[PDB]
Amino acid sequence: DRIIEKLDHGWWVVSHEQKLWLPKGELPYGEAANFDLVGQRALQIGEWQGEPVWLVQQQRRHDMGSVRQVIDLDVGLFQLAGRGVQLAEFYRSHKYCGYCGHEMYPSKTEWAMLCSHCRERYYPQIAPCIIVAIRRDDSILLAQHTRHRNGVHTVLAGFVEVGETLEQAVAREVMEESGIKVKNLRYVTSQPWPFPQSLMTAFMAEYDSGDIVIDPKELLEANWYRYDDLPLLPPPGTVARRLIEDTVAMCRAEYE
Amino acid sequence: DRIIEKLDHGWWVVSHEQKLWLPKGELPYGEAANFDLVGQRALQIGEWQGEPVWLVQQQRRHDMGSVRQVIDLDVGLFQLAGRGVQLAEFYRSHKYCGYCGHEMYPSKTEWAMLCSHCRERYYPQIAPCIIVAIRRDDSILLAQHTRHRNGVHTVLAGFVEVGETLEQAVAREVMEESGIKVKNLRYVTSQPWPFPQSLMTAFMAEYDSGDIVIDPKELLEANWYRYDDLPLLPPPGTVARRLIEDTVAMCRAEYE
Numbered sequence: 001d002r003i004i005e006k007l008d009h010g011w012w013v014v015s016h017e018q019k020l021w022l023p024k025g026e027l028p029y030g031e032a033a034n035f036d037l038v039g040q041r042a043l044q045i046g047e048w049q050g051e052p053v054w055l056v057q058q059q060r061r062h063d064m065g066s067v068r069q070v071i072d073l074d075v076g077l078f079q080l081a082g083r084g085v086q087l088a089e090f091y092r093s094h095k096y097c098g099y100c101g102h103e104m105y106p107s108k109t110e111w112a113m114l115c116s117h118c119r120e121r122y123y124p125q126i127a128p129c130i131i132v133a134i135r136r137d138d139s140i141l142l143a144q145h146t147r148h149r150n151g152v153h154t155v156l157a158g159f160v161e162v163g164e165t166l167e168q169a170v171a172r173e174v175m176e177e178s179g180i181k182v183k184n185l186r187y188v189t190s191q192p193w194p195f196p197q198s199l200m201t202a203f204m205a206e207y208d209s210g211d212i213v214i215d216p217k218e219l220l221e222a223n224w225y226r227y228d229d230l231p232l233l234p235p236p237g238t239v240a241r242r243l244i245e246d247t248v249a250m251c252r253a254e255y256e
Numbered sequence: 257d258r259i260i261e262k263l264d265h266g267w268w269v270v271s272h273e274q275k276l277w278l279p280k281g282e283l284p285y286g287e288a289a290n291f292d293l294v295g296q297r298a299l300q301i302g303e304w305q306g307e308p309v310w311l312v313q314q315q316r317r318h319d320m321g322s323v324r325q326v327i328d329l330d331v332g333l334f335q336l337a338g339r340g341v342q343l344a345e346f347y348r349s350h351k352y353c354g355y356c357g358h359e360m361y362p363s364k365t366e367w368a369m370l371c372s373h374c375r376e377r378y379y380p381q382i383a384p385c386i387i388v389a390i391r392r393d394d395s396i397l398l399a400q401h402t403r404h405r406n407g408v409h410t411v412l413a414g415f416v417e418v419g420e421t422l423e424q425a426v427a428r429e430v431m432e433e434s435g436i437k438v439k440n441l442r443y444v445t446s447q448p449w450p451f452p453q454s455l456m457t458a459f460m461a462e463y464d465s466g467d468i469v470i471d472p473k474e475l476l477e478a479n480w481y482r483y484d485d486l487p488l489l490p491p492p493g494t495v496a497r498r499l500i501e502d503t504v505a506m507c508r509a510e511y512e
């Protein structure tokens with residue numbers, strides 16, 4: 001925890017309220033005074049290729065966007081940046097203590113909120129998430145998400161809920177977004193996600209029953225595409241893509 | 257959300273600070289005035305066999321204990337009770353808003369904290385957890401946990417951390433508690449846990465390298481026991497036991 005000076009340079013995660021500053025569509029890299037940043041509080045969340053990445057918790061008029069606007073920067077950088085945004089949001093939600101109501105402060109040893117008056121603390125929360133590829137014979141369920149809009153067709157995902165298992169989270173999510181029923185869930189892998197903090201677990205499923213009834217609020221559209229007649233997909237390096245690949249592998253195994 | 261009266265009866269989760277009231281070693285069942293409970297605030301967290309279970313957020317001098325003192329009551333009851341304790345702890349940690357510092361109130365529609373001044377809210381957090389059975393040829397790694405003390409020998413478990421995968425959480429936990437290195441992780445299943453709120457994922461692993469170096473703060477002792485010369489185990493119905501069973505099944509498959 002330091003205060004920025006006139007020769008300070010590197011990567012700057014300037015984050016307010018779920019968004020980060022992205023001038024010219026860029027994650028800012030350079031000197032502090034070039035970014036109107038001198039005299040502010042900055043935390044170092046790590047290093048990219050030997051250069052500090054800083055979290056500055058300040059609002060900016062223009063060019064705030066989503067961290068998943070830097071995904072194609074480097075996954076490693078995105079981990080840093082998403083981690084910054086999460087840490088900013090963590091700090092926002094814990095200025096006061098939920099116990100006793102007096103102002104809290106950041107632990108400089110670890111990454112928690114400590115407390116002046118009382119001795120209770122808070123730690124970052126990890127949200128369990130399911131993600132799933134659904135298979136129906138020669139085809140696989142792909143879909144365009146509403147909030148996304150790159151014209152990509154990916155798999156289904158949703159948050160695990162209270163009192164339920166991964167498998168049940170998959171079944172419910174699939175029921176709600178698509179309106180179909182699945183079977184023979186197979187765990188594939190897991191992958192942490194920076195913002196919001198979450199651990200997604202990857203599942204293959206196969207179609208059991210039902211017709212596609214998209215939640216239009218959530219899904220632009222959903223369709224069964226054959227394993228060799230696919231549309232655009234999430235980029236290689238992403239979990240969703242790996243799942244789709246695994247499914248295509250299943251289909252190939254049966255029909256070729 | 258109601259206030260208790262003189263003829264109110266049923267199951268009472270009287271919970272303070274991670275503990276619940278267990279008179280005579282019992283989860284209290286009966287009439288309110290019999291339990292000095294009239295005139296207090298009670299929330300209904302559900303029904304056991306058609307009878308209400310109530311959460312009362314009050315301290316009691318004697319006989320407070322751990323919810324995992326009612327595990328052998330009925331799993332369903334324990335879900336209710338553990339859920340009560342969690343909900344009490346949730347309320348304790350969110351009396352004030354972490355944003356703005358003014359007193360918050362419970363959402364009566366869903367189970368969150370709403371806010372008087374501002375419009376930010378909080379929801380219950382689910383903690384990802386790994387649990388793992390480690391296999392070394394004809395044997396399986398079993399261990400007595402320090403905080404437990406029923407003379408039972410169970411599997412290893414620990415909390416998933418930030419920026420890491422399930423598999424990495426397993427590898428690290430196993431490294432720290434036991435000091436050995438594992439390989440060929442296989443996902444088995446997942447199971448939610450009431451208090452503290454967590455979703456544990458079950459893994460089988462096999463021994464790769466190292467000698468047993470127990471964390472004496474965490475583990476009474478750890479040993480390799482053969483699949484047909486076992487000690488006491490966690491009771492049937494529990495995930496740990498199912499894992500141990502699956503492992504024994506592996507051993508039997510190879511050596512018989």
Ligand SMILES: NC(=O)c1ccc[n+]([C@@H]2O[C@H](COP(=O)(O)O)[C@@H](O)[C@H]2O)c1
Pocket residue numbers: 068129154157158193195196197198200233234235238239240241
């Ligand atoms: N190609 C992709 O865009 C891709 C692939 C795999 C996972 N994911 C991500 O998994 C993330 C999980 O995010 P949440 O934590 O909001 O569920 C999604 O936001 C999604 O972007 C994305």
Ligand SMILES: NC(=O)c1ccc[n+]([C@@H]2O[C@H](COP(=O)(O)O)[C@@H](O)[C@H]2O)c1
Pocket residue numbers: 324385410413414449451452453454456489490491494495496497
């Ligand atoms: N036989 C047993 O006692 C048994 C079996 C399976 C899971 N578990 C539970 O998994 C629970 C996970 O608790 P945490 O959420 O504290 O990790 C452990 O507390 C453990 O009691 C217990």
Ligand SMILES: [Zn+2]
Pocket residue numbers: 097098099100101102115116117118119120
């Ligand atoms: Zn406090």
Ligand SMILES: [Zn+2]
Pocket residue numbers: 353354355356357358371372373374375376
């Ligand atoms: Zn508030």
